[PDB]
Design an enzyme around this catalytic site. Structure first.
Site, short mmCIF file in Angstrom:
data_model
loop_
_atom_site.label_atom_id
_atom_site.label_comp_id
_atom_site.label_asym_id
_atom_site.label_seq_id
_atom_site.Cartn_x
_atom_site.Cartn_y
_atom_site.Cartn_z
N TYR A 1 0.83 -1.19 0.00
CA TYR A 1 0.00 0.00 0.00
C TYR A 1 0.87 1.25 0.00
O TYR A 1 1.98 1.28 0.46
CB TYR A 1 -0.99 0.02 1.16
N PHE B 1 1.58 9.50 4.15
CA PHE B 1 1.81 9.22 5.58
C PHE B 1 2.37 7.82 5.79
O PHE B 1 2.88 7.57 6.87
CB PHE B 1 0.55 9.41 6.41
N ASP B 2 2.23 6.94 4.80
CA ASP B 2 2.82 5.60 5.01
C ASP B 2 2.96 4.87 3.69
O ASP B 2 2.22 5.20 2.82
CB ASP B 2 1.96 4.68 5.89
N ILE C 1 -8.40 -0.73 9.55
CA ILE C 1 -9.52 0.16 9.36
C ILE C 1 -10.62 -0.50 8.52
O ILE C 1 -10.35 -1.34 7.64
CB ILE C 1 -9.12 1.54 8.80
N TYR D 1 -10.25 6.45 10.84
CA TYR D 1 -9.93 6.71 12.25
C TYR D 1 -10.87 7.75 12.87
O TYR D 1 -10.64 8.15 14.04
CB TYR D 1 -8.48 7.14 12.38
N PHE E 1 -5.80 5.63 -0.50
CA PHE E 1 -4.83 4.58 -0.59
C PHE E 1 -4.76 4.02 -2.01
O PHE E 1 -5.77 3.88 -2.67
CB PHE E 1 -5.19 3.40 0.31
#
Lengths: 127, 5
Positions: free
Chosen positions: A45, A55-56, A75, A101, A118
């Protein structure tokens, strides 16, 4: 860019039909089978916030992310969205906070009330 | 811990 496109042109894949999770199939995967509840799934991802921050990313860590599907380990948008994928599929997901979240956020990179983008690749799934 | 929870 991609987050705008899936916002405007994505398909609602929720059961509620509340546009909480929108999807575009970017690379069609193999055959017809999708994973089942409790399968071990392996994904790559990349995640962006609505302000453009990446962010990731699993690619940057040189290992996939592995979880058990449909068990609430991730999630809600991922349980929902990965359950629709074929092996070898790449999709884009646009996740409203209710399926991510919520008002809590996730320290340190995800703010309260965050809509998330994503790109997900389903590498494999096994019981 | 994103990606958890």
């Amino acid at each position: 860019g991609a987050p705008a496109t899936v916002t405007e042109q994505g398909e609602d894949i929720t059961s509620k039909k509340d546009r909480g999770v929108l999807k575009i199939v970017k690379r069609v995967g193999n055959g017809e089978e999708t994973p089942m509840i409790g399968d071990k799934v392996y994904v790559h991802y990349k995640g962006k916030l609505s302000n453009g921050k990446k962010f990731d990313s699993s690619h940057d860590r040189n290992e996939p992310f592995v979880f058990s599907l449909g068990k609430g380990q991730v999630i809600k948008a991922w349980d929902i969205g990965v359950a629709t994928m074929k092996k070898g599929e790449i999709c884009h997901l646009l996740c409203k906070p209710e399926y991510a979240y919520g008002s809590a956020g996730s320290l340190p990179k995800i703010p309260s009330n965050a809509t998330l983008f994503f790109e997900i690749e389903l590498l494999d799934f096994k019981g | 811990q994103f990606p958890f929870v």
